[PDB]
Design a binder for this molecule. Structure first.
Ligand code: NI
Length: 341
């Protein structure tokens, strides 16, 4: 059944709750972003109002064929009325079109639902600064102190310098980048930009990217693989078997692959710096795992919450085990005692 952490009290609303059938008493279904664990259940047969960002609405229409009459896109940073309740969508610094949702309940309670987010100090100067938030529905994906990772900027700097050096040493090297969802477009776009290439990809992936309102996108991507030296493939294909196979397909245009797998966290982060990352190599194939995250680190999450000072926190991730739930509740209490709220 629909879990309680997907329901917004005092409303008829649910958040990211499309796989339970008809949720009894739900008058409006919000969708924070277009990732499959969140949209699971939507299709062209859905006949209830869906509230979301413009970008998420483009992907619902074009990829899932949800009918236009049920898609209700809202602008960001704008007070809107939904079934009689004031809401605001805020940028979540996750993947394209990803939002956080502020609900202003008739009784005076204010609720923030983060969806999936990567907390950032810039959020401390949004419409969040303007009033008190009583309840926080929090993306706790990396809510443990072992989860450190570098800034997105440091990671992109590493990838750009690595690719540029490899291809300048060998003009017959191909660069490959893995993907299985929207998000992390900076990795492959930044590398293509430094090499003066477009990124080549499948028709299905090109269609997905043309939904994202990225400026000058027609200048950066293509379905012509032959004219491109940065290829996107399914993340599943980013291994030695899959990459050897792909190299055969390029008809001796290339004699070397340099591949990037943008992982979330991997336990080489507890020891190794970004400057010190090395690839796995077999023959003329090298694979780099790079820690490009679109979720908060433990420290970024802690700063956000100690800034916001909510009265109650409801985790939305890692809620399935008692040991996880109990550990998270211990960090929340530490945070509150250290900061004094
Ligand atoms: Ni997500």
């Amino acid at each position: 059944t629909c879990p309680f952490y997907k329901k917004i009290p005092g409303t008829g609303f649910t958040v990211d709750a499309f796989q339970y059938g008809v949720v009894e008493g739900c008058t409006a279904y919000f969708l924070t972003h277009f990732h499959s664990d969140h949209y699971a259940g939507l299709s062209k047969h859905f006949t209830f109002p869906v509230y979301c960002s413009e970008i998420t609405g483009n992907l619902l229409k074009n990829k899932l064929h949800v009918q236009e009459q049920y898609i209700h896109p809202l602008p960001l940073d704008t007070e809107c009325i939904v079934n009689g309740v004031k809401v605001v969508l805020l940028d979540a610094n996750h993947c394209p079109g990803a939002v956080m949702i502020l609900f202003y309940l008739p009784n005076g309670t204010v609720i923030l639902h983060t969806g999936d987010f990567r907390a950032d100090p810039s959020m401390e100067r949004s419409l969040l600064a303007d009033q008190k938030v009583h309840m926080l529905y929090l993306d706790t994906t990396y809510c443990s102190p072992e989860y450190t990772f570098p800034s997105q900027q440091e990671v992109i700097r590493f990838a750009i310098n690595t690719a540029f050096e490899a291809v300048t040493l060998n003009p017959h090297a191909l660069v490959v980048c893995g993907t299985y969802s929207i998000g992390k477009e900076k990795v492959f776009l930044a590398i293509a930009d430094v090499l003066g290439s477009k990124v080549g990809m499948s028709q299905e992936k090109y269609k997905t990217l043309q939904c994202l309102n990225i400026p000058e996108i027609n200048s950066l991507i293509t379905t012509d693989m032959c004219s491109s030296l940065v290829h996107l493939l399914p993340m599943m294909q980013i291994n030695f078997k899959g990459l050897q196979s792909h190299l055969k397909k390029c008809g001796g245009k290339y004699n070397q692959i340099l591949a990037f797998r943008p992982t979330g966290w991997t336990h080489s982060n507890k020891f190794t710096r970004i400057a010190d990352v090395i690839p796995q190599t077999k023959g003329n194939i090298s694979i780099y795992g790079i820690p490009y995250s679109e979720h908060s680190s433990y420290l970024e999450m802690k700063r956000f919450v100690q800034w916001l000072k909510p009265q109650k926190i409801i985790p939305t991730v890692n809620v399935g085990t008692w040991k996880s739930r109990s550990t998270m509740e211990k960090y929340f209490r530490e945070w509150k005692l250290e900061a004094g709220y």
